[PDB]
């Protein structure tokens, strides 16, 4: 069996079928566009912090720190892609390069462990809770977020070798995920009490963005197996789709999320 590409799904397909120049180039450009948008996000949150009352600026700060970590780690992920796979002129495809370092989703997973807590935390600086304690929500978010990403990371090891383990850890991870959604809805509901109808409208959009953007991750996790073990997506197409959904998700969950919280902060601040 394959000793080289046993690490993850990307390595496996790279070590066996290889990637068409279209698939490799597409994935390369989408990862580059990924970190490019984080760098543009970083400068947006820096330049706009003066547009919100001091009260809300901790949200804009956390957006900025998320953009820094995202840019740096997704830049690493992009380099990790182009370095891991070299062209073979004989076969006319890209294959896992033994002389390079093997492809590694650890860059993105580490980014998640850092950003998930900050992203969950930062809404508590724009909204006021009603009947819930700030510390309780914070602790619930931080714990469930860490556990979601840790169980998810553990599950990701058994992605190729043991699908039973892959899905069980994935389901454990999904349990913590559903708890986060449940608390976030509660937070957003309490957030709507006490604010103008304009601000309640933005919180509605934040909720839908949050719900969709965050649901793309377990989608991308499962992406290789959504058509079976011999399916359309058990190929370079599964790798394409996954890295594309991860990028869409990362841009929506971090950058768009942050822009809507800043907009919320602005309609709250200086608007009477
Ligand atoms: C800035 C990056 C963000 C918001 C990352 C979010 C990550 C998740 C919501 C991932 C959760 C997962 C599951 C629900 C099950 C499978 C494993 C994960 C980690 C992909
Ligand atoms: C009133 C709201 C204004 C929305 C502006 C959003 C700007 C966010 C910056 C990130 C997007 C730029 C993408 C560039 C890719 C390189
Ligand atoms: C009042 C200052 C507002 C300036 C915002 C300009 C947005 C810059 C986009 C960065 C990419
Ligand atoms: C729970 C998530 C923990 C992720 C740790 C993995 C760190 C990998 C760093 C980049 C890849 C190194 C090669
Ligand atoms: C009590 C219900 C609140 C949580 C809403 C969850 C929506 C579906 C999750 C999709 C995955
Ligand atoms: C119905 C109102 C739509 C605005 C909310 C945001 C749209 C969802 C974006 C999904 C993220 C990918
Ligand atoms: C006034 C409300 C506007 C909110 C929408 C802001 C969307 C910014 C998009 C940034 C990411 C674009 C990625 C390019 C592909
Ligand atoms: C690359 C784009 C940063 C503003
Ligand atoms: C890594 C710890 C797993 C806990 C499962 C509930
Ligand atoms: C991968 C680009 C993200 C598109 C913004 C909605
Ligand atoms: Kr900032
Ligand atoms: Kr940076
Ligand atoms: Kr950081
Ligand atoms: Kr860099
Ligand atoms: Kr899920
Ligand atoms: Kr939570
Ligand atoms: Kr809450
Ligand atoms: Kr690919
Ligand atoms: Kr997106
Ligand atoms: Na290469």
Author numbering: 2 to 273
Please give me the paper's original passages concerning this structure:
High pressure atmospheres of argon and krypton were used to produce noble gas derivatives of crystals of three well studied MPs (two different proton pumps and a sodium light-driven ion pump). The structures obtained using X-ray crystallography showed that the vast majority of argon and krypton binding sites were located on the outer hydrophobic surface of the MPs – a surface usually accommodating hydrophobic chains of annular lipids (which are known structural and functional determinants for MPs). Taken together, the results obtained show that, in addition to binding in internal cavities within the MPs, noble gas atoms interact with MP hydrophobic surface at many sites and displace lipid molecules bound to their surfaces. In the experiments described here, we extend our knowledge as to how noble gas atoms bind to MP molecules, showing that they readily interact with the outer hydrophobic surface of MPs by non-specific binding at multiple sites and in particular compete with binding of lipids to the surfaces of the systems studied.
In total, 47, 35, 11 and 19 noble gas atoms were identified as partially occupying positions in the four crystal structures (tmBR-argon, tmBR-krypton, KR2-krypton, MAR-krypton, respectively). Moreover, at many positions (11, 13, 8 and 6, for tmBR-argon, tmBR-krypton, MAR-krypton and KR2-krypton, respectively), noble gas atoms replaced, at least partially, lipid atoms, with an altered conformation of lipid chains being sometimes clearly visible. Overall, the derivatised structures do not differ significantly from the native ones with Cα r.m.s.d. value not exceeding 0.3 Å; rare side chain position alteration was observed. However, in the particular case of KR2-krypton the backbone of helix E is displaced about 1 Å near the site of two krypton atoms bound in a pocket proximal to ß-ionone ring of the retinal molecule which maintains an unchanged conformation compared to the native crystal structure. In the case of KR2 described here, surface-bound noble gases occupy excavations between α-helices allowing them to closely approach, and perhaps modify, the chemistry of essential co-factors (retinal) by modifying their environment (substantial structural perturbation of the end of helix E). Taking into account the absence of noble gas atoms in central cavities of KR2 molecule, it may be of interest to investigate the functional outcome. Secondly, and most strikingly, all the crystallographically observed positions belonging to the 2nd group (“MP surface” positions) were entirely represented in the results of MD simulations except one krypton position hidden in an excavation, passage to which is blocked by histidine side chain in KR2 structure (in fact, this position is not accessible in the MD experiment as are the internal positions, binding to which requires more significant rearrangements in macromolecule structure).
